[PDB]
PDB file of C-alpha atoms in Angstrom:
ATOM      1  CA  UNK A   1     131.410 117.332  95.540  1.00 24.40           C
ATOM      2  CA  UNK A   2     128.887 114.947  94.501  1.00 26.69           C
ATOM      3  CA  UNK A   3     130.078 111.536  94.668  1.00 27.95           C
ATOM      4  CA  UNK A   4     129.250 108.392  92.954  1.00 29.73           C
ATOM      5  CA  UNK A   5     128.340 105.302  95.255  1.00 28.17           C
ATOM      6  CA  UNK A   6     127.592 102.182  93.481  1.00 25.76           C
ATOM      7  CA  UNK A   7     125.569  99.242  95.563  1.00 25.59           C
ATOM      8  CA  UNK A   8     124.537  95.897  93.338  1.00 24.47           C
ATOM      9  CA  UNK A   9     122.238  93.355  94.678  1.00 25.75           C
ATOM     10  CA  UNK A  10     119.589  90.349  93.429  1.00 24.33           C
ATOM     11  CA  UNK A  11     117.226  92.582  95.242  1.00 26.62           C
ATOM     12  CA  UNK A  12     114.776  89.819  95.167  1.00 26.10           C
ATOM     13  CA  UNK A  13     111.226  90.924  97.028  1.00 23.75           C
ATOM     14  CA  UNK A  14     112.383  93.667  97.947  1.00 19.10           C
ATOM     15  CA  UNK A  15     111.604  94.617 102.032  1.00 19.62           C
ATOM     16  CA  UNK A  16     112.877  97.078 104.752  1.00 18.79           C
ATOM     17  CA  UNK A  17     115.923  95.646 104.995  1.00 16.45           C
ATOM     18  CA  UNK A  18     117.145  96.532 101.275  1.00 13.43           C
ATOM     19  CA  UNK A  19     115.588  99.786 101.463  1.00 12.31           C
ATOM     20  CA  UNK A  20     117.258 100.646 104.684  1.00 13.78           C
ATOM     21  CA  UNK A  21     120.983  99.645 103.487  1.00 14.00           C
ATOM     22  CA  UNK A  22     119.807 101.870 100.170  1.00 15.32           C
ATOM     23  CA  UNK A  23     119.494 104.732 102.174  1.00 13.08           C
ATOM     24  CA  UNK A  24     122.542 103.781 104.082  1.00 11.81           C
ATOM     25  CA  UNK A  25     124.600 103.987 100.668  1.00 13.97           C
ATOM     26  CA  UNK A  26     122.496 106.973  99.898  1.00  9.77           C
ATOM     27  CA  UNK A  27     123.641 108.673 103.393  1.00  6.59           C
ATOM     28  CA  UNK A  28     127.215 107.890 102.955  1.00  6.97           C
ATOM     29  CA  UNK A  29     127.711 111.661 101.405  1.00  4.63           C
ATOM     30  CA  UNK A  30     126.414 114.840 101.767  1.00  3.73           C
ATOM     31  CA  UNK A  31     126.213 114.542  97.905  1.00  3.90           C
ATOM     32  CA  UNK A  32     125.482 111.629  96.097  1.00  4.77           C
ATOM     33  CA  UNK A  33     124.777 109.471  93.102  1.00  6.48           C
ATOM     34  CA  UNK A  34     123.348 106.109  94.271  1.00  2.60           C
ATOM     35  CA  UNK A  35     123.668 104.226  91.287  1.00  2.00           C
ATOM     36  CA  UNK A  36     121.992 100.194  92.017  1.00  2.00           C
ATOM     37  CA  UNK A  37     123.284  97.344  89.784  1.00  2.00           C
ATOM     38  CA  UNK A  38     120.545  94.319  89.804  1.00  2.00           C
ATOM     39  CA  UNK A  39     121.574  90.924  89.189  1.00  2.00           C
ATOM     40  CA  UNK A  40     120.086  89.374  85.952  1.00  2.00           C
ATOM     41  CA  UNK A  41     117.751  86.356  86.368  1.00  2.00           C
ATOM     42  CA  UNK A  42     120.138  83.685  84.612  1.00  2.00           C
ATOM     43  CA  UNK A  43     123.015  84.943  86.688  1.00  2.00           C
ATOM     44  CA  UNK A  44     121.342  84.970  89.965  1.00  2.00           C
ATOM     45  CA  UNK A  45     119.836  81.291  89.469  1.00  2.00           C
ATOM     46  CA  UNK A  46     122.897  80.066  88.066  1.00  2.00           C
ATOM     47  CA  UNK A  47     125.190  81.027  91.411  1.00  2.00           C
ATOM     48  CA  UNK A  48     122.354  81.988  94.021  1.00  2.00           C
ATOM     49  CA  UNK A  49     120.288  79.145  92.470  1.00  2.00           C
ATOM     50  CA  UNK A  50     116.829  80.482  92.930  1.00  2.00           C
ATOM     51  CA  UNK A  51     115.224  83.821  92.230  1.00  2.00           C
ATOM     52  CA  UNK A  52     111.506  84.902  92.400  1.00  2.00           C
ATOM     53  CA  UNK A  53     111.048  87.988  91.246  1.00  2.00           C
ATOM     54  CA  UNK A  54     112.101  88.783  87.239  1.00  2.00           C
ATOM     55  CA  UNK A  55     114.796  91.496  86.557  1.00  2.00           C
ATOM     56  CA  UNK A  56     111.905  93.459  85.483  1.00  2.00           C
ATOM     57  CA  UNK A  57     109.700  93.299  88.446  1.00  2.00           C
ATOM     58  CA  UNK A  58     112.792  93.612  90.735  1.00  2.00           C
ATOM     59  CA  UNK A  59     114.212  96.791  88.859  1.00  2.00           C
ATOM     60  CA  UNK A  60     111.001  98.113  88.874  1.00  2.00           C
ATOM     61  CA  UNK A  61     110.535  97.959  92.311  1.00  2.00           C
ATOM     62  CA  UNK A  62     113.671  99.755  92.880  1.00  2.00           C
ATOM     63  CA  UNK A  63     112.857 102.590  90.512  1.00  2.00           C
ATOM     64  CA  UNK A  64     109.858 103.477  93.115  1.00  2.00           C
ATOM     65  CA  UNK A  65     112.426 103.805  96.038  1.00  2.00           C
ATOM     66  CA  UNK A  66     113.459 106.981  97.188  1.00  2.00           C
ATOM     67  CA  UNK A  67     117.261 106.966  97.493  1.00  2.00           C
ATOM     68  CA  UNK A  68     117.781 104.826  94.080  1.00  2.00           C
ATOM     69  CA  UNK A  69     119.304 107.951  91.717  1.00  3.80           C
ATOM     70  CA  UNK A  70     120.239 105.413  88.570  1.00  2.45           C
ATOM     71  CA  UNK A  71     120.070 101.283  87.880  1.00  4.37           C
ATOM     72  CA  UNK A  72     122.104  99.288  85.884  1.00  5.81           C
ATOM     73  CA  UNK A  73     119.741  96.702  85.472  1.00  8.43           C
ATOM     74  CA  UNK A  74     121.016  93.980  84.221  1.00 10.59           C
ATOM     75  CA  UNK A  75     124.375  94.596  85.870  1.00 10.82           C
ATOM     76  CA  UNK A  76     127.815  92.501  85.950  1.00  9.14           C
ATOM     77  CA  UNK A  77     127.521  89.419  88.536  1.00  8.53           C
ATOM     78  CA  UNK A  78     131.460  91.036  89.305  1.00  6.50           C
ATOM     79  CA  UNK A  79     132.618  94.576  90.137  1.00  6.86           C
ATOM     80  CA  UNK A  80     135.587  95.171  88.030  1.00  6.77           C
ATOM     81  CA  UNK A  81     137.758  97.869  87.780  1.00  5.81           C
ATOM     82  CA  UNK A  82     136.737  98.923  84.162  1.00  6.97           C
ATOM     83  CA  UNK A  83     133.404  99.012  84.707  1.00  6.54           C
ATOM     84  CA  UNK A  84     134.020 101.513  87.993  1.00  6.49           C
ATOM     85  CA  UNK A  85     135.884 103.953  85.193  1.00  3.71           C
ATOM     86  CA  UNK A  86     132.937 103.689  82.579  1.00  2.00           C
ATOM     87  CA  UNK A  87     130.236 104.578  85.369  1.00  2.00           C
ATOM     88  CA  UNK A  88     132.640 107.077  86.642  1.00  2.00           C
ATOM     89  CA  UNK A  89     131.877 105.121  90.118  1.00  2.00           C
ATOM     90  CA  UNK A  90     133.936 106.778  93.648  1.00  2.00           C
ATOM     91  CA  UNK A  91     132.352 103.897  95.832  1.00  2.00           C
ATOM     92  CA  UNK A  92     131.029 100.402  95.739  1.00  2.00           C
ATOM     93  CA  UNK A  93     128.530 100.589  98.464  1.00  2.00           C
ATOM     94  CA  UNK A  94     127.566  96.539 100.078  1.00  2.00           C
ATOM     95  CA  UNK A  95     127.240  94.363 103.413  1.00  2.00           C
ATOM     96  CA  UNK A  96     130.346  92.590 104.632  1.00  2.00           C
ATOM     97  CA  UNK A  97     129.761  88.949 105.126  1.00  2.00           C
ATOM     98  CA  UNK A  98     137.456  88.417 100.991  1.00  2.00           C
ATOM     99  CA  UNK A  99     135.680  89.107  97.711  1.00  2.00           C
ATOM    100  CA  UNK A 100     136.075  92.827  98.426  1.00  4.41           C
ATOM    101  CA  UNK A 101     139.829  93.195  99.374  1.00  5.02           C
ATOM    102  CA  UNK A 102     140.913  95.261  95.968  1.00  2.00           C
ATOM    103  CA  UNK A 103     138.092  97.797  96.645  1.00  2.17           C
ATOM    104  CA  UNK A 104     139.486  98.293 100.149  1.00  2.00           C
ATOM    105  CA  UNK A 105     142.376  98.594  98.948  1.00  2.00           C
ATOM    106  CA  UNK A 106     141.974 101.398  96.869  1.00  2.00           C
ATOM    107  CA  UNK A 107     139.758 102.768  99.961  1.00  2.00           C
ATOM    108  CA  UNK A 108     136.332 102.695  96.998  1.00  2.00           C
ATOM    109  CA  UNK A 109     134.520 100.044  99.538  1.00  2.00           C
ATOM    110  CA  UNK A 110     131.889 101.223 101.650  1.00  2.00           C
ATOM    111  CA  UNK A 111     130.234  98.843 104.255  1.00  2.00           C
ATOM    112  CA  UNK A 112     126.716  98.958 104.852  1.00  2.00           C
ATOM    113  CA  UNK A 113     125.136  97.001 107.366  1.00  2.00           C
ATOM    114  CA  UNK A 114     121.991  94.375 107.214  1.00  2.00           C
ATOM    115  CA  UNK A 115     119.741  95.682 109.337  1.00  2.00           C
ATOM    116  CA  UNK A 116     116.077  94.268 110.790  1.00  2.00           C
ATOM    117  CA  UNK A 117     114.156  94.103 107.672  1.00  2.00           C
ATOM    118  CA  UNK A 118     110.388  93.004 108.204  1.00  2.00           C
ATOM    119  CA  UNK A 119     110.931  90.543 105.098  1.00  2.00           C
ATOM    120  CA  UNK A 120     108.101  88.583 103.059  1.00  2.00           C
ATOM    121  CA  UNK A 121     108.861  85.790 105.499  1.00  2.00           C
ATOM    122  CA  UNK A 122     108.749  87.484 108.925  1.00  2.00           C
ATOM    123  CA  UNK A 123     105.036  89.364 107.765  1.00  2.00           C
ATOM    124  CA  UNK A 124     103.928  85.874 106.694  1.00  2.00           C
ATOM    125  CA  UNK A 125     104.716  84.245 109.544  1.00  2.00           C
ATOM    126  CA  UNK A 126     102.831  87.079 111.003  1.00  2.00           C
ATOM    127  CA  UNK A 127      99.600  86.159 109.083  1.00  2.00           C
ATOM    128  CA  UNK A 128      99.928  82.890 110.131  1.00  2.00           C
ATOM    129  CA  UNK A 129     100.494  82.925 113.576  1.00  2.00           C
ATOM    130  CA  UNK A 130      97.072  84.173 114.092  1.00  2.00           C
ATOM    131  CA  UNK A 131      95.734  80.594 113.010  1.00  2.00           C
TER     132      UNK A 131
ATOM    133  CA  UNK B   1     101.980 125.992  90.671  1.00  2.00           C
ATOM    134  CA  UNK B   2     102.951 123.612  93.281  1.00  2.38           C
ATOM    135  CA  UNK B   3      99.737 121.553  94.096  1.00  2.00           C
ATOM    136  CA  UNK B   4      99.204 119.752  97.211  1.00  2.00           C
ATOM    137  CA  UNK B   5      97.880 116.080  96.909  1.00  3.67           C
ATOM    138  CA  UNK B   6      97.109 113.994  99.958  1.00  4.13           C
ATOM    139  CA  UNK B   7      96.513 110.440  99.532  1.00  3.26           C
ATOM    140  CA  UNK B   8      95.418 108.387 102.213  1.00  8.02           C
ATOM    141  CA  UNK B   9      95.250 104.870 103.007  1.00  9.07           C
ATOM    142  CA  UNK B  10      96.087 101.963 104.890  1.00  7.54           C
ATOM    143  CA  UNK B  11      99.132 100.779 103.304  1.00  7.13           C
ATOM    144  CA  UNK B  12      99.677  96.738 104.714  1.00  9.28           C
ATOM    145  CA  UNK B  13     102.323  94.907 103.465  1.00 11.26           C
ATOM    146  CA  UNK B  14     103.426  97.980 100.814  1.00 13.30           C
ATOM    147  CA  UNK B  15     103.801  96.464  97.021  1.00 12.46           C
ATOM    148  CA  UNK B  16     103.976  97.587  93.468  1.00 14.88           C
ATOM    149  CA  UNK B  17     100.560  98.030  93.365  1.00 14.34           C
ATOM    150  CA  UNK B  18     100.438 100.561  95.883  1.00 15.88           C
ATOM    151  CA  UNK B  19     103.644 102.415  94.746  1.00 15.28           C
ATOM    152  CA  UNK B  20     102.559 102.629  91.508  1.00 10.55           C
ATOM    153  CA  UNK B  21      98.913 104.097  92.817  1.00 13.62           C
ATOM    154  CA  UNK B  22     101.834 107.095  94.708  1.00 12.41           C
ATOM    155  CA  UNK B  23     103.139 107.441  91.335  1.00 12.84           C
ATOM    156  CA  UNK B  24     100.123 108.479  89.545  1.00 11.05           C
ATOM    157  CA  UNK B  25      99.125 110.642  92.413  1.00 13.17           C
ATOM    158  CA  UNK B  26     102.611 112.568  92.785  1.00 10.08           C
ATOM    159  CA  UNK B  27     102.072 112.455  88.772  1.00  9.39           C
ATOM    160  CA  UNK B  28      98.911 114.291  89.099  1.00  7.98           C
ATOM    161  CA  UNK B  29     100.299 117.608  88.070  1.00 10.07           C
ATOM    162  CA  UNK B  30     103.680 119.070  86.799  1.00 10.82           C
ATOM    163  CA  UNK B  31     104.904 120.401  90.550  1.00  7.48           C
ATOM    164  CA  UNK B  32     102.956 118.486  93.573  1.00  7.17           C
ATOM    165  CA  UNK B  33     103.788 117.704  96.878  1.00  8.75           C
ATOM    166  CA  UNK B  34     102.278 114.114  97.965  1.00  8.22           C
ATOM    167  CA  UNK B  35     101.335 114.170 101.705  1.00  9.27           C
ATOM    168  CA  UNK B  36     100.426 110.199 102.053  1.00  9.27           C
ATOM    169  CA  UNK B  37      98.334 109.672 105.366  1.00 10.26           C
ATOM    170  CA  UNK B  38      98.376 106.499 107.075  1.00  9.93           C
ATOM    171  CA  UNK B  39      95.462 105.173 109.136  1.00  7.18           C
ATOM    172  CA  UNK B  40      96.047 103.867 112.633  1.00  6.97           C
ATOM    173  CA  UNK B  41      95.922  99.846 113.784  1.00  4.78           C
ATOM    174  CA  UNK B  42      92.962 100.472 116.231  1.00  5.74           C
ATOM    175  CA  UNK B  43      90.775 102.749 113.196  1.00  5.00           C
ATOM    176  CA  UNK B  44      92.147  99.716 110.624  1.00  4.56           C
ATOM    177  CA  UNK B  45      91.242  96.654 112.656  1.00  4.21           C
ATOM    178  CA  UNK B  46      87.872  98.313 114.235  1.00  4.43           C
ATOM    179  CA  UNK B  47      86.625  99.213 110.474  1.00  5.29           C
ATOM    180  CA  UNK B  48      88.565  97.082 107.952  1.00  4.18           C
ATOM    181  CA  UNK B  49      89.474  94.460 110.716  1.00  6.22           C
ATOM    182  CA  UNK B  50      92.753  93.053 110.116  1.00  7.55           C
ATOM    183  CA  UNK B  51      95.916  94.813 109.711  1.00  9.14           C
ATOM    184  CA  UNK B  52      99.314  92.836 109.484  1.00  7.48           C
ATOM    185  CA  UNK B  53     101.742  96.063 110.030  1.00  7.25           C
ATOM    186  CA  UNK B  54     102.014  98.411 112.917  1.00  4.35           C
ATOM    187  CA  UNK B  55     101.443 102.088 111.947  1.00  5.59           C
ATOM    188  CA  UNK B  56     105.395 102.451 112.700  1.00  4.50           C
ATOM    189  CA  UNK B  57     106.150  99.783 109.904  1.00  2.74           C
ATOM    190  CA  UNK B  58     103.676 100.645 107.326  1.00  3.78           C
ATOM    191  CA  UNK B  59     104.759 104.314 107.620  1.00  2.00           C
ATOM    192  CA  UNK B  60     108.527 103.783 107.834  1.00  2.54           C
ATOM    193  CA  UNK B  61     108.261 101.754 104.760  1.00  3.92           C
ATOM    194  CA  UNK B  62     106.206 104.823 103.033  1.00  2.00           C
ATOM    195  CA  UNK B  63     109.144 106.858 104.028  1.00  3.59           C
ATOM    196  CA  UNK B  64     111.190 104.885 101.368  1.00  6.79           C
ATOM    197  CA  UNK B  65     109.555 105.969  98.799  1.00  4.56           C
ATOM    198  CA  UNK B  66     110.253 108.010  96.162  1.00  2.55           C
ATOM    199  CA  UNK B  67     106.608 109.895  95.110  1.00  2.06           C
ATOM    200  CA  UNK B  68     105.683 109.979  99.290  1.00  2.00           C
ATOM    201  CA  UNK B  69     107.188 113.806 100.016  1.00  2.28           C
ATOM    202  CA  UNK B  70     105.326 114.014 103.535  1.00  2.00           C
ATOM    203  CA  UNK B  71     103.695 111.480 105.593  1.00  6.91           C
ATOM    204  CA  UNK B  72     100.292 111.930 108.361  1.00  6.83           C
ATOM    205  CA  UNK B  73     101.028 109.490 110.724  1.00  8.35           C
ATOM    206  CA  UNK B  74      98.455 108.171 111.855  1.00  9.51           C
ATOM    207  CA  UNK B  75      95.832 110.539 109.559  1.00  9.67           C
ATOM    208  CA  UNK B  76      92.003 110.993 110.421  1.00 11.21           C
ATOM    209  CA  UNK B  77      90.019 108.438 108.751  1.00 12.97           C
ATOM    210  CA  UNK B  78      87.553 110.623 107.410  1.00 12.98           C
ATOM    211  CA  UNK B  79      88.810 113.565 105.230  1.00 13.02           C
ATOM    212  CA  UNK B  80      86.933 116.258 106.300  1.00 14.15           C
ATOM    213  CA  UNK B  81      86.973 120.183 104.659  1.00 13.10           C
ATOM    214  CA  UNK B  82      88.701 120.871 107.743  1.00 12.58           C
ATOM    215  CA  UNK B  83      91.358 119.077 107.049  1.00 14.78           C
ATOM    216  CA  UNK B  84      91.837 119.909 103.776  1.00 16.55           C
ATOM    217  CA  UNK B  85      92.142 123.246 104.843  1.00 17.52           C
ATOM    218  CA  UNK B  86      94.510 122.825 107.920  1.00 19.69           C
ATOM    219  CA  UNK B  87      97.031 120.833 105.397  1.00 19.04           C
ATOM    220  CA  UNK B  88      96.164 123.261 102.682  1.00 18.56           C
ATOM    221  CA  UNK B  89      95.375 120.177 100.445  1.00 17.60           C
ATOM    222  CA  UNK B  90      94.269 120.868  96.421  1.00 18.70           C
ATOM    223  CA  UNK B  91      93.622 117.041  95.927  1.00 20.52           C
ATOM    224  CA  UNK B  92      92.444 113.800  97.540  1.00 21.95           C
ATOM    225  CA  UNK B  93      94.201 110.923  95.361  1.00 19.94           C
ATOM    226  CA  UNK B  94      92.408 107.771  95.850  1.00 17.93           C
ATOM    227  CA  UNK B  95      91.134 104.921  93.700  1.00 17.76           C
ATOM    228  CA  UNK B  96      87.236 104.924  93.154  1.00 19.63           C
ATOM    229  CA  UNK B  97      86.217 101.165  93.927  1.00 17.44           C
ATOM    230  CA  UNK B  98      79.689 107.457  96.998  1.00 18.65           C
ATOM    231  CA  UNK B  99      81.994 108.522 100.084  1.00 16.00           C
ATOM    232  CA  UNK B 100      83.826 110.893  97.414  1.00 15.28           C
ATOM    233  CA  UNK B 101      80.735 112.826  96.168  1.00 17.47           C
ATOM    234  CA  UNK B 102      81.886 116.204  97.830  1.00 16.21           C
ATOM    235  CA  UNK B 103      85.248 115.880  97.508  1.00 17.95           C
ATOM    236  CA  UNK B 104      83.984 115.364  93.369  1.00 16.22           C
ATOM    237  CA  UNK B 105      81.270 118.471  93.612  1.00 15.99           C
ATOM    238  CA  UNK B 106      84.256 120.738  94.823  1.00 16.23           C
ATOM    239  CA  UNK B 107      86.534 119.390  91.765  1.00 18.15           C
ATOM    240  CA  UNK B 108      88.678 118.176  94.816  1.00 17.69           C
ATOM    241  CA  UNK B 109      88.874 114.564  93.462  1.00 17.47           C
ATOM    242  CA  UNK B 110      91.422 112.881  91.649  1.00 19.95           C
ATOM    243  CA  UNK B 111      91.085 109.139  90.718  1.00 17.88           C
ATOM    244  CA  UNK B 112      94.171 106.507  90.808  1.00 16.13           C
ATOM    245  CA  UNK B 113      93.279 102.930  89.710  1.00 14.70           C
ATOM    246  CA  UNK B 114      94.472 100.024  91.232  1.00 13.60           C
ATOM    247  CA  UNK B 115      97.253  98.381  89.019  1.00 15.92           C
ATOM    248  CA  UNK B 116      99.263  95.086  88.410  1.00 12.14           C
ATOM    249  CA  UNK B 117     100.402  94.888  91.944  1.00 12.76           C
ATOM    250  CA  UNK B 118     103.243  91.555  92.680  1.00  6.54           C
ATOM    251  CA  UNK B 119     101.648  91.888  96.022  1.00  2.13           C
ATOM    252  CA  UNK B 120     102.953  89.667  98.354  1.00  2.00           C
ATOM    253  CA  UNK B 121     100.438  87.003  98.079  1.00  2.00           C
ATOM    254  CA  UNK B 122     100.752  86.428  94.696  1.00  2.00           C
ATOM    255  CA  UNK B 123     104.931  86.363  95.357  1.00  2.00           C
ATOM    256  CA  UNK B 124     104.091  83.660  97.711  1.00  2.00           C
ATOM    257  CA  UNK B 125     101.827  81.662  95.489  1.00  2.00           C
ATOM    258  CA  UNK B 126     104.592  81.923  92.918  1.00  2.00           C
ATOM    259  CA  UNK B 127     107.137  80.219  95.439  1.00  2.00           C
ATOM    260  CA  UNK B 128     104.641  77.531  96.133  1.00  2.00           C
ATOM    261  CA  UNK B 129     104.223  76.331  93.066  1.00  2.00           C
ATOM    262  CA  UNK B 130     107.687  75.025  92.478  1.00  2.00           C
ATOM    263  CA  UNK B 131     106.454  72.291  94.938  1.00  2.00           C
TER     264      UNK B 131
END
């Protein structure tokens, strides 16, 4: 019954929006794991090219949110299909922006959706606005 | 055994900081519930006289997390007895920076200190300083 739903990230200052598409992996189940994977630093700089927050702050931050069950902190830049048997994972649980095909395929991908997040950048544009 | 804690506050621009100040306060004892109030824009602006979040966002994003069980939306900004007694509170959580001197004399009074918080300021001094 309870199922395993994986969703990996950078998870860089970490807003609304993340924590909404958390719950949304969360929420895919009646039961659930939510396992989140979090992108180490040299990975993320080395094909996102920037990153501001270390793996531990950003890990950290994610251990205080609600739906987060387990992290894999550092976790694989790639899903592969070993490391869905080791973590015993049912579902890989991310927004669709076809680097996803195979999970389709095997019906383990799980869509969740970007959603208005009141981001860093939105609240400081906020602040400043006012001046 | 399960002790009610109530922890108010007006929450802007959530960060570590505060969720590690929730932490300690759900922490408080071995079963708790946390009821996190959350004071209103008008009561914020007219006596701390900013705020950069609506009640609606500061309290949805208290909603994500984990150590918030139940939320007063938008709470008094006074705790009086008679509130502790209509939300059969145990507890007022709250860092001591003396408005707390009965809440103390009634052994009603627990401290939480004010941590390392990567509030959002210092996140955006840190992206800053690359240029």
């Amino acid at each position: 019954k309870n199922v395993v739903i994986y969703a990996d990230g950078v998870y860089d200052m970490l807003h609304l929006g993340h924590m909404k598409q958390l719950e949304q992996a969360k929420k895919l189940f009646e039961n659930t794991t939510l396992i989140v994977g979090v992108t180490s630093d040299n990975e993320t700089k080395l094909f996102k090219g920037q990153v501001v927050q270390t793996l531990e702050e950003r890990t950290e931050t994610l251990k205080h949110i609600r739906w987060v069950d387990e992290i894999i902190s550092p976790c694989p830049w790639v899903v592969t299909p070993e490391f869905l048997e080791k973590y015993k994972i049912d579902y890989v649980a991310h927004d669709d922006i076809d680097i996803y095909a195979w999970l389709k395929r095997a019906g383990k991908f799980k869509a969740t959706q970007r959603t208005e997040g009141v981001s860093t950048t939105d609240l400081i544009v906020r602040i400043l606005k006012n001046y």
